[PDB]
Amino acid sequence: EFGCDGTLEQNDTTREVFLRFHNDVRKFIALGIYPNKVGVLGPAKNMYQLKWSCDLEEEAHESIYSCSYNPLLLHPQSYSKLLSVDLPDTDVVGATLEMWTEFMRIYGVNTKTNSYNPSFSQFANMAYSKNTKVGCSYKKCGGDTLVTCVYELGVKLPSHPQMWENGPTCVCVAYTDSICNDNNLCEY
Amino acid sequence: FGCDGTLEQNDTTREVFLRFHNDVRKFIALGIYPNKVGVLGPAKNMYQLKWSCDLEEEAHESIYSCSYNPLLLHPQSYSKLLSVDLPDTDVVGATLEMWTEFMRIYGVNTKTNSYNPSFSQFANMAYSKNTKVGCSYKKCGGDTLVTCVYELGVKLPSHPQMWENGPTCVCVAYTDSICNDNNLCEY
Ligand SMILES: *[C@@H]1O[C@H](CO)[C@@H](O[C@@H]2O[C@H](CO)[C@@H](O[C@@H]3O[C@H](CO)[C@@H](O)[C@H](O)[C@H]3NC(C)=O)[C@H](O)[C@H]2NC(C)=O)[C@H](O[C@@H]2O[C@@H](C)[C@@H](O)[C@@H](O)[C@@H]2O)[C@H]1NC(C)=O
Ligand SMILES: *[C@@H]1O[C@H](CO)[C@@H](O[C@@H]2O[C@H](CO)[C@@H](O)[C@H](O)[C@H]2NC(C)=O)[C@H](O[C@@H]2O[C@@H](C)[C@@H](O)[C@@H](O)[C@@H]2O)[C@H]1NC(C)=O
Fold first, then answer.
1. What is the three-class DSSP state of A186?
2. Measured in angstroms, how far is the CA atom of residue A168 from the centroid of ligand 2?
3. CATH code of the domain occupying A1-188
4. Distance to chain A for B37, nearest Cα, Å
5. How many whole angstroms separate alpha carbon A98 and alpha carbon A115?
6. What does the domain layout of chain A look like in residue ranges?
7. Fewer CB atoms near the end CB (10 Å): N or C, chain B?
8. Does the CB atom of residue A113 touch ligand 1 within 6 A?
9. A91 lines ligand 1 (CB under 6 A)
């Protein structure tokens, strides 16, 4: 599920944190039980399972390599700079991902449109229903640690801000020959 | 710690909670804790926190039903997290880091060090005159609840100051205070 050989300064423990965090968020949106600011997100039809992409992880790694964020702009990308602390790497990674979702919970999703909002831009990239690939990276840059995820597909702003379509769990039709896996997420 | 109660927590996460708080507080006291721009502090009357099993009880009780219901006896910080398949210490660490990162998103006004609801958890953690904290967490299926209870905190509107600007180791808020080896006040 990973197999990323490169000089990426990361091993699979944090990659699994990244990957399963995304797919847990997406499963609970699809099931209609992820908590909004008030109430719940979802259910969503067309919410696809994410797979790791080593190419996208390289894009994530390259954007923070110099210790100043510089995205390649080939793919949607979420980024945050956190204070480096004397705790394990899973803690920074976890803190970033939790923070990305708390932005959403602090501001609140309109669950009629499920539109992107700049105040939870990272959550929108993480929840974008029709994406199927993610790659993330982090780098300690002295007093700060940069954490960033890159996605194959994302919202297209401003015209197409919808993060996911309201619909029944396991309705998987956005790609031909899609099935719903045991995670309650679509795959193709 | 010595918290005997049915608190569903052991001392390893208690230490992460406590040490994290006192690191932040001493970095503010020394004037080296990063703000959004620049640094926070130095602060006078920044007291070291001690654990309180009573406050931990108040924390544990507010979340044991998996819906947040504070007792409202003491200032309290709370977050509902997405559950992660990581050791509990790392979920606690991630939460505490996240609480500080809110502050650096909005930024503290270092002329006033005023409370800001947008970083309420950092504010509760940084409140200089508090000396006791109790924290708890509970895995609730897909989500995890994490919360800290403080004996003292800001009082709005009358006392919005998280800490007062001033020299490290000035410890006069309470009589018979001293500055310990952590450069934090205690009595
Ligand atoms: C990704 O890298 C991290 C950081 O190196 C790995 O986590 C570390 O894994 C090592 C073991 O390979 C842990 O060390 C050992 O800890 C135990 C308990 O104290 C002791 O028996 C042993 O003496 C100790 N070794 C030494 C010399 O210290 C280490 O504690 C652990 N965490 C950190 C922050 O260093 C990680 O390994 C994965 O996670 C650990 C927790 C184990 O489950 C391990 O089997 C896993 O592979 C690396 N991930 C991968 C996939 O390799
Ligand atoms: C609190 O609960 C933790 C989870 O059960 C304990 O960690 C576990 O300790 C085992 C040895 O007793 C060790 O083999 C396990 O890998 C470890 N599990 C995890 C997820 O870390 C913890 O014990 C403390 O921490 C571990 C890492 C060791 O250093 C122990 O010697 C420690 O006591 C429990 N804490 C206490 C104070 O009992």
1. strand
2. 42
3. 3.40.33.10
4. 12
5. 20
6. 1-188
7. C
8. no
9. no
Experimental method: X-ray
**In sequence order, what DSSP letters do the residues of chain B get, joined into one string?**
----SS-S--HHHHHHHHHHHHHHHHHHHTT-EE-SSSEE--EES-BPPEE-HHHHHHHHHHHTTSS-----SS-EEEEEEE--SS-HHHHHHHHHHHHHHHHHHH---TTTTB--GGGHHHHHHH-TT--EEEEEEEEETTEEEEEEEESS--BTTTB-BSSEE--TT---SSTT-EE-TTS-EE-
Provide the token pair at B168: 């490290």
Whether residue A122 lies within 8 A of chain B, CB to CB, comes out as: no
Reading the block at residue A134, the tokens are 């993610």
Q: What is the resolution of this structure in A?
A: 2.0
Q: Under CATH, what is the fold of the domain B1-187?
A: Pathogenesis-related Protein p14a (3.40.33)
Chain A interface includes B141 (CB < 8 A)? no
